[PDB]
Amino acid sequence: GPLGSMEDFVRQCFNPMIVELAEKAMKEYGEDPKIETNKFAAICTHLEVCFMYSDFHFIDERGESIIVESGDPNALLKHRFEIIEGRDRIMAWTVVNSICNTTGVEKPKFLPDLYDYKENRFIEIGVTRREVHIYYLEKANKIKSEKTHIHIFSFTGEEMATKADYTLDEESRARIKTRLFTIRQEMASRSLWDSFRQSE
Numbered sequence: 001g002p003l004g005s006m007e008d009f010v011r012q013c014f015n016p017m018i019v020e021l022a023e024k025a026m027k028e029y030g031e032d033p034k035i036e037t038n039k040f041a042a043i044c045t046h047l048e049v050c051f052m053y054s055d056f057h058f059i060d061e062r063g064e065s066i067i068v069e070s071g072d073p074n075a076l077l078k079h080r081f082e083i084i085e086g087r088d089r090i091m092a093w094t095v096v097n098s099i100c101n102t103t104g105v106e107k108p109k110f111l112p113d114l115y116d117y118k119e120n121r122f123i124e125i126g127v128t129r130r131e132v133h134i135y136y137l138e139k140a141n142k143i144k145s146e147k148t149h150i151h152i153f154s155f156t157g158e159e160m161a162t163k164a165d166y167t168l169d170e171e172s173r174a175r176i177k178t179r180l181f182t183i184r185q186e187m188a189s190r191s192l193w194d195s196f197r198q199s200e
């Protein structure tokens with residue numbers, strides 16, 4: 001088949017909000033999305049997974065975690081997760097500091113992806129085109145904050161999480177895995193996958 005451009009793929013297959021946040025992040029770190037294109041797709045993918053991990057998860061009036069998949073959550077519901085990824089540096093640390101000095105949870109050395117108000121911990125999300133165990137160890141060795149929970153997804157459906165604690169129900173994680181499989185399949189139709197996989 002014809003070889004498509006990763007640029008076209010990203011713009012067609014991700015929400016404009018996600019694409020814009022990804023471009024802003026790459027700029028901040030001095031990478032050009034029109035040149036590091038496999039990286040731009042990876043950043044979008046990771047951001048989307050962070051959002052999906054958060055979606056539909058609330059804390060109810062009794063303080064219990066619940067799932068609301070309709071469009072309207074009753075006004076008394078609280079989002080279960082704080083999303084750190086996607087924010088610029090200053091705002092991201094502002095949010096982390098607020099959580100920390102409030103909940104008593106200790107300050108991570110690197111910006112994590114999420115904070116879980118049910119489990120009372122930061123989460124680092126990872127999305128890998130390689131074996132989940134290898135990537136898990138890489139993340140763990142990088143942060144070693146060792147209060148930060150790590151949850152790794154691969155494009156082929158494997159997961160690895162700290163202490164075999166997967167935080168979410170199967171259905172939620174299935175949504176994420178389905179999305180990753182969709183991304184892989186579409187890239188493959190455009191002959192973009194092989195190179196995207198090998199670039200990590």
Ligand SMILES: O=c1[nH]cc(Br)cc1O
Binds near residue numbers: 025026043086
């Ligand atoms: O948190 C980030 N680190 C590095 C890159 Br490139 C993009 C991010 O959002």
Ligand SMILES: O=c1[nH]cc(Br)cc1O
Binds near residue numbers: 042043046113125126
């Ligand atoms: O937290 C992350 N930020 C950006 C990238 Br690319 C990967 C991450 O795990």
Ligand SMILES: O=c1[nH]cc(Br)cc1O
Binds near residue numbers: 086
């Ligand atoms: O995730 C990010 N979003 C925006 C900026 Br600027 C930097 C990030 O790491």
Ligand SMILES: [Mn+2]
Binds near residue numbers: 079
């Ligand atoms: Mn809301």
Ligand SMILES: [Mn+2]
Binds near residue numbers: 085086087
């Ligand atoms: Mn970021």
Ligand SMILES: [Mn+2]
Binds near residue numbers: 085
């Ligand atoms: Mn992050």
Ligand SMILES: [Mn+2]
Binds near residue numbers: 046125126
């Ligand atoms: Mn991450």
